[PDB]
From a paper:
C-reactive protein (CRP) is a pentameric protein of 115 kDa composed of five identical non-covalently associated pentraxin domains. The B-face binds to a range of ligands, with the canonical example being phosphocholine (PCh) head groups in lipids such as phosphatidylcholine. This is a calcium-dependent interaction, with each CRP monomer chelating two adjacent Ca2+ ions. The A-face modulates many effector functions of CRP, such as activation of the classical complement pathway, where binding of complement component C1q to CRP is mediated via predominantly electrostatic interactions between the Ca2+-containing globular head domain of C1q (gC1q) and the A-face of CRP.
Decameric CRP is formed from the offset stacking of two pentamers via their A-faces. Intermolecular contacts between monomers within CRP decamers were also dominated by non-covalent ionic bonds, which formed a second ionic zipper, perpendicular to that found in CRP pentamers. Ionic bonds included Asp163(chain A)–Arg188(J), Glu170(A)–Arg6(J), Arg188(E)–Asp163(F), Arg188(B)–Asp169(H) and Asn172(C)–Ser181(G). Asp169 and Arg6 were able to form additional salt bridges in decamers compared to those formed in pentamers, whilst still participating in monomer-monomer interactions. Although decamers appeared to adopt C2 symmetry, they were solved without symmetry applied and reached resolutions of 3.3 – 2.8 Å. No major differences were observed between the decamers at different pHs, with or without PCh, other than the proportions of decamers to pentamers. Intermonomeric ionic bonds found in decameric CRP at both pH 7.5 and pH 5 were similar to the crystal structures and the cryoEM-derived pentameric CRP at pH 7.5, except for at Glu197-Lys123 where there was a larger distribution of bond lengths, indicating conformational flexibility at this location. The proportions of these varied between conditions, with pH 5 containing more decamers than at pH 7.5, 68% vs 44% decamers, respectively. No crystallization is required for cryoEM using single-particle analysis, hence these decamers represent solution-phase structures of CRP, previously posited based on analytical ultracentrifugation (AUC). Residues implicated in C1 binding and/or complement activation are predominantly located on the A-face, and therefore binding of C1q to CRP will be sterically hindered by decamerization, which could inhibit complement activation by CRP at low pH.
Residue numbers in the entry:
A (entry chain J), B (entry chain I), C (entry chain H), D (entry chain A), E (entry chain B), F (entry chain G), ...: 1 to 206
């Protein structure tokens, strides 16, 4: 097993082929999820980029967190999308957590430990468990059809996924970094393979 | 009576049907009141929304705390309005306390523990005791005739009401959430009825 | 004598009839003085207003502390006037101390414990003891001829006066709320007469 | 959960009743750890005292940091003790960090950013996760059997725990106060209960 | 008031008659205080002496800061005592602050800007407001019964008293002589009476 | 000589006659100096003003610290000038230190304890000791020819002059007001002559 | 060797001739380096300037750290360049660390202890060992052809160089003034020739 | 060959089996050598220990750097011993360099960059090339017959060996750490075999 | 008169005949004085020696500064004596200032710029102005009867006398050698006569 503790994937150039693919142990479909990660990029002013691409064979945008230029975070489940407008962006490593509960469709979006207002999305939908989870690229087909103009350039790490909505107090722990253990996707117990020009480096963020 | 502590009502979509109705065990018509609440919504940039609607058969806007777009807090008692103009509104959870006394008609409006200047309103009025207290909607009938364009979207919680003007010292403790005991309307002992899509979730705020 | 400690005069409407007259014991002409007060008004958004009027039978602006629109504090003694041009004004209680010495005419203006540059005004003048001290109105005759366009709206309190120039240390103890003994006009021992709609309420400012 | 930054627990009298109990919801057993803390006491010449007591139900001294009078720091894991002799200790706040690695049993003790020599302890052992973590007292049973002659008298704070061995350059960051993310026990995000006479005060140490 | 700034009471010879009485405008009974002062004396290697003696009519040792031969500072409140043992003493001006809080009885003793360990004393007591404050002597009645063997011989100055516990940040400013405003007993505005052989000299200590 | 501690010269009106002349007990020509002073003036946005005018019969601008409108500080030695442009000036008391060394011509300028970049001026020059040092005016003869447009209005004090370049650590303590001994011009021991409307007052800055 | 600790090279004038040449007997060609330094200059808003110019006989820009006007830090290795655009330059002493690893070509750029995003440069290149390191000038031939329009004006110090990439924790140690051991270029152990008008002065920066 | 940069060998237990054997590519008999190393041990006050054991087939103490209890560093070549008395020894890592020259027998012994007095040992002797270099043990045969009472308990690292006398200037760089290239035994490029309980850890010294 | 600046009298040999006698332009009997001088001698562990001897026809010990072996500085006025005990003397040049005031009897004694505690002596006495000042001998008659066992051996210089008590500030400048103007006895303007073996030499102290 690989323990990524204090290590981040570095995607130091724009390309369509540098990416890492993550394997979840998940088999049953998701009635809820929380995903959290650190990322650090310069792109935000220049262009949009894919942060986190979760594609099932039914749907290439089954979970997508997308920075949209001059807009903010696009959050999409099942191809349906909502925006958390971010009007001023700062060159610092940013930590996000995003939780989606099917039963109500409530999306919480958390940036550096601050919550966004709970929006509604895709109430009653079910996320498929058979997924190609890709970091560094946007996939428009199951595990493929990357576009360089949507690649992440820079750092991504601490990528953790839960099959349930974390409470606010939990998320405070994640941000400050107290003890936690994910069950869908564990940074400390990460099954992954790396394709293209991708490096593991010490994380820049504490 | 439910201890709603740590929990908030989530109004995740614009609708004309999602509201919670709060039941006051209130006998005497109000010579004075204090209402305090947290809310968190992004609409402030976008449109007006009803924070707190208190209606009676003779008067639908018997108390209205209303965000008016690009203006700030409308405060109404008995159909008469005053404004606490807010030139710029943070996308953060806002705690407001508002207190009105019939003998003087002084309104104190408090935002996040900071007092606005006292303003006169409706000296010698007397607020009807038998009232429809609606969260999430503005109301024009006794308990209905809502408007989608004025529904709150996002969170409302810690809704406490006193039949008297708290001194500044109490209002400090409320903003701290220190030891206090409402008597008209107690979040720790809320009697309420929920209609439409309204969800009770962990509050996003201290 | 009334101990006004912790209490403020509230002028919640503009009128030319609401004023509180302060009775000084002073019988000997002032060759120097200091006047400190807390006030709270949003009128700065709107118009000029009298903070503090001190009229003698001869001269109605014997001491005037006046907010001049787009300018700031207009300090005039014996009808002659100086500006402390204030670049930016905010919705906060403001504590001012202003002291004048005949022997040199040095005016010191202190705002929230920050000194303005010393200016000379009316060197060699002498201020008459037989005066009418009015809060809430600018005063153009010994007890009257008020203008609504110049009234105070909101809060005035801690109105203390000395017949000598306080030192910088002494002023710091006023602002930080230490012990002091005003010998002309004592908030803790105020002889005063409310007229019209003026209220005594707890000071909003700590 | 409370942010304890800048604050310390004060245990101002010898007793067996005053303690604070820290919650670490660890799931996986600790194969390695680092614990760092600030403490301030004058007992060091009078008697021994428990700095940091970690107890499992099988083992009450599962991690103990103990000052042995006229000896120095006692570091025990799984009930076996090693001494870091300290021929004199001054009346000053002392920052200690101690790391233990199962894979080697190397114990690394740091006092005010100076390492002691590395020593071997409990090579191949494993520390149980379900534990009672106590400040101010020494445990002789899980969560209890405190003994006044072993209580801390004085201050303890900045209690941070990692489930891995910090490198020497990381420990300098802690000592110098650079940013860090404790993965087990986070002072910024501390979950605790207080029992008996214990107070939260501003830290005396920088 | 006298501005004592940079001036010290010199008690150059042993006597039982020479003392300074300090008048505090104090009427509320003190739930907490800070005493800070400079003193300079040879006696420390020879006999005990009163540093700072505060008496009420019911208690001659209401607050006492006493040097005890071969022991150190004795801090006593309401007649109950604790020792801050000073193992070895040198001939230099020493700046002390002492803080006491009723709500916990924590005594903070500060020597030249270094904190002693927090100790417990007289929790829940209250210090009487009507007091005789004497420098140079230890009083056993309200203002008398001095003893020559307990008199201070040497320099005392910068006697500042607060009715509240200064935070450590503050106290550093004190010891640096940063801007500070004592609200109970202020050097820069000292109301005092001298009896016998006490001289006002330039302070030796910077 | 006078100890001017905690006192400032006040130049409360614009004139050409009000100035104070400071006498340097100096006989040997200066190969280096440090001059530090506090001043407080509104003029900064209106017009230029002389801060510190040092003239000799050879050279009326032998040292000139001069505010040039919208430029900032002019520092001139021997009539040759360098600028420390200050793009925004604010109404606050400002402490400057300026240092000149002949052996290198390095000018250190310091504002409120922050150093400007070292610039070179007048390498190898030597400054005459027989000088008229005038505050409040720019002198264009040895001791006269003032210009009202160049007078200081406001306050100047703590003028301390050294015949050597203070190290940065020294200049730090000055700004803190640690103990220091200026050997050319000492505010604790100032010999001065006051001409016209100039007052000694308590200094407004801390 | 000379210990430059606490000392900076001052380049107080624009010149083509003022430089210091630093000697490293670097034997092995660099597959990695870190260079860290403090510099202080006002030119940032005026024009570009060379910070750190390292040349080999084959390549005049073998390592160059260059401020480029209204853009920021030009980092080039082997004549290939990347930009860390800086939109808004404080005039304050700035600490930078830059590291380059051949194996990846990852450039880390750190400004006042905060990392820029990692960028790719010259993957697989090797930096020549026989090199001339110039402070104060940009060199276009192995040891000359300096352009005064590119000279640094201001301070350079703490110039430490490692032949390997420092971890983030090592860089926090450098910036916080912790203990470090440079294996290529050592301010504590610096061997250099001053040429032209360069002075050694105490550093203006902590 | 391994780069042991920033790593140390750790001997955390007293044993006669834990050692590392260093394989010098030494082709020729040594007329001169320098050996420099960092080591860190408590034993110095307890008992003697081998630092650096060089044995040829002919001579088991061909070079031995030995801490003999209460004396200090025993330096012996060819079985002939000189003592550098170290009367006070401390718990700090100690960097030693030691050089011996056949042509003169002058031994330079350097402790933390301080030279001991030069001493004569074994003039004209010639050290054999066929040598077992052992760290952690003192060998009485070629590669064997260790004694647990002479083992190093603690850290050793930066083992660099030159077949020539380093000048003092070189030694300085060694101690501070600038660029150097050893030709007999290179820590940057080390061939070593590990026997028993020996660990490689991050070095504790900077 | 001779400017003796930078020069000291050297008394290289014990004798009862070597002295320098200093002539005071002093006529009014001293109500107060300060004397400051540098001396350097190794006798302090051998025997007592006269530092400074002031005689009148009526009183040979009118002012005596005397080192009394194992005690310290004997200071006597009118034959009344106080000791400033020195715990351990050091072999270095020492600067003392000692000052006396009749009106209070207070003695200030300064050693190397550090004040001793003020001690009372001879209050209300007056020192005779018709005086013989001798350096190098203790005089038991008006200008004679010296004792070799009391002679100074070594150096004395910078002997300055004021008819008044210098402030602490002033004494600092002395010790630093800032500009100062003695009015009783001026080393820059010295009248002296020399008998026996005394030499003028460059001063050893800085
Ligand atoms: Ca897609
Ligand atoms: Ca795409
Ligand atoms: Ca309505
Ligand atoms: Ca409506
Ligand atoms: Ca008028
Ligand atoms: Ca009017
Ligand atoms: Ca136990
Ligand atoms: Ca026990
Ligand atoms: Ca007593
Ligand atoms: Ca007594
Ligand atoms: Ca001019
Ligand atoms: Ca001029
Ligand atoms: Ca070039
Ligand atoms: Ca060039
Ligand atoms: Ca052997
Ligand atoms: Ca052996
Ligand atoms: Ca005698
Ligand atoms: Ca004699």
């Amino acid at each position: 097993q690989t323990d990524m503790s204090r290590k981040a994937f570095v995607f130091p150039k724009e390309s369509d082929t540098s990416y890492v693919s993550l394997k979840a142990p998940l088999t049953k479909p998701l009635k809820a999820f929380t995903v959290c990660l650190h990322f650090y990029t310069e792109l935000s002013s220049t262009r949009g980029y894919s942060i986190f691409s979760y594609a099932t064979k039914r749907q290439d945008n089954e979970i997508l967190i997308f920075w949209s230029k001059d807009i903010g975070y696009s959050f999409t489940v099942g191809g349906s999308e909502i925006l958390f407008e971010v009007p001023e962006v700062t060159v610092a490593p940013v930590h996000i957590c995003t939780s989606w509960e099917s039963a109500s469709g409530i999306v919480e979006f958390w940036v550096d430990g601050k919550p966004r207002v709970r929006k509604s999305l895709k109430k009653g939908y079910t996320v498929g468990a058979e997924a190609s989870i890709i970091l560094g690229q946007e996939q428009d087909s199951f595990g493929g059809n990357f576009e360089g103009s949507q690649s992440l350039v820079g750092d991504i790490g601490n990528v953790n996924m839960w099959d349930f909505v974390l409470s606010p107090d939990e998320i405070n722990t994640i941000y400050l970094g107290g003890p936690f253990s994910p069950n869908v996707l564990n940074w400390r117990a990460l099954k992954y393979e790396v394709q293209g020009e991708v490096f593991t480096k010490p994380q820049l963020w504490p």
